[PDB]
């Protein structure tokens, strides 16, 4: 049961407005589907001990170009996901050993060039 | 002022079902987002006359392939929006000319070599 997460970005309201809020949305193979329009981020994906995890970027127009550069946050320091480059998607396995609860992080995406992040959590159950 | 419409596919969900209900959404430049769980479908893209449209598809795993196939139905019936396939995505402009209201239109979509449809209807004002 491996999850699979698309990060789709409006590249055009994101350089416009500086800020990927309300311009990034997560859509993963749970069927969860999400937006960011005001406050904290809140966009987040649940998963379970030991589950493979795959995040992929793209855009909303066929022009631009989306890429995850990087990720950051308690998610990697807790060591709870690691991913790693593969292909153009990132790709990592939960560790918790029984604990449960959200792990913050921070993905940094390449918009046209331009870098942004947003802040997301995994859920671990 | 183009709107670029982005169409996700939960390969895995779509294939395993032969449906693409719960597995297929819209998002789109105006910041609309839709997913299709229930009933008959209702994701819809908003334009005015003179508008250009952009359609392309994409899959949330980065291991599979999505592609618009076509259009057929009211939309290119009454020609109120006629797409035509530029590289990877299909682009039309609407040319309604004064009259607005709702189009239905059907997307064929090529799923891992599977044709597939949905049935979303362009609205405009």
Same mark, same amino acid.
């Given at each position: 049961?491996?999850?699979?997460?698309?990060?789709?970005?409006? @590249? !055009?309201?994101?350089?416009?407005?500086?800020?990927? &809020?309300?311009?990034? =949305?997560?859509?993963?193979?749970? #069927?969860?589907?999400?937006?960011?329009?005001?406050?904290?981020?809140?966009?987040?994906?649940?998963?379970?001990?030991?589950?493979?995890?795959?995040?992929?970027? @793209? !855009?909303?127009?066929?022009?631009?170009?989306?890429? &995850?550069?990087?990720? =950051?946050?308690?998610?990697?320091? #807790?060591?709870?996901?690691?991913?790693?480059?593969?292909?153009?998607?990132?790709?990592?396995?939960?560790?918790?050993?029984?604990?449960?609860?959200?792990?913050?992080?921070?993905?940094?995406?390449?918009?046209?060039?331009?870098?942004?992040?947003?802040?997301?959590?995994?859920?671990? #159950?």
């Amino acid at each position: 049961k491996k999850i699979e997460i698309l990060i789709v970005v409006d @590249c !055009a309201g994101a350089l416009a407005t500086t800020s990927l &809020i309300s311009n990034v =949305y997560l859509i993963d193979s749970n #069927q969860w589907l999400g937006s960011w329009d005001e406050g904290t981020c809140q966009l987040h994906t649940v998963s379970e001990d030991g589950q493979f995890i795959c995040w992929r970027s @793209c !855009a909303i127009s066929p022009d631009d170009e989306v890429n &995850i550069t990087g990720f =950051y946050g308690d998610m990697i320091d #807790q060591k709870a996901c690691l991913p790693s480059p593969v292909n153009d998607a990132w790709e990592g396995r939960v560790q918790t050993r029984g604990d449960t609860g959200r792990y913050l992080y921070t993905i940094s995406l390449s918009i046209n060039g331009i870098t942004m992040n947003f802040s997301p959590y995994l859920e671990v #159950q």
